Design a protein around this ligand. Sequence first.
Ligand SMILES: [Cl-]
Ligand SMILES: [Cl-]
Ligand SMILES: [Cl-]
Ligand SMILES: [Cl-]
Ligand code: NA
Ligand code: NA
Ligand code: NA
Ligand SMILES: [Zn+2]
Length: 184
Amino acid sequence: VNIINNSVCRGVAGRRVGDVKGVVIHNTWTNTTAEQEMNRLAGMTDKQLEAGFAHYYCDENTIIRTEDTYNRAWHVANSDGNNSYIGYEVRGNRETPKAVFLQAEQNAFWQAAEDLRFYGLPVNRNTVKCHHQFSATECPKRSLMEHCGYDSTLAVPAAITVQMQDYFISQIKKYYDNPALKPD
Ligand SMILES: [Cl-]
Ligand SMILES: [Cl-]
Ligand SMILES: [Cl-]
Ligand SMILES: [Cl-]
Ligand code: NA
Ligand code: NA
Ligand code: NA
Ligand SMILES: [Zn+2]
């Protein structure tokens, strides 16, 4: 997997105050490459970045760190979420091929495990969260369809949220506990 560190989000949200609390696994609900996502952010004004961005963008081949993890990111429309949780964007919409989406997901899980291990956090329901636990959204919609069978515009039910967390936790913990394991 190609690793690219390029902080195109320019630190506009400022440094995190306080400890890291966990990670949020997003889906872009687009079918663009991680590099296309990076270029899109690089071409925005700092005002346009106010619409939102994450710390990493991942596709089947690439992990791009678009914001240093010591900075906040405007990724969940919630102040404590934006301050305390690191955001991972997985390439994935309805058109993305299954195997491409699943590889992209694994790349994000591997990077999330690296960061949880670095900050010394456990891998559990406190530290692995979904965007819709912070604010109203269907995200992570493709993960929800693939792993929970939930393809809907209704607000994600609590039992499905827990199931999606547990899936994310199982994948992240596999990398967390096995530091030499690679996502490909
Ligand atoms: Cl999103
Ligand atoms: Cl904002
Ligand atoms: Cl397919
Ligand atoms: Cl909510
Ligand atoms: Na997006
Ligand atoms: Na934006
Ligand atoms: Na985004
Ligand atoms: Zn999201």
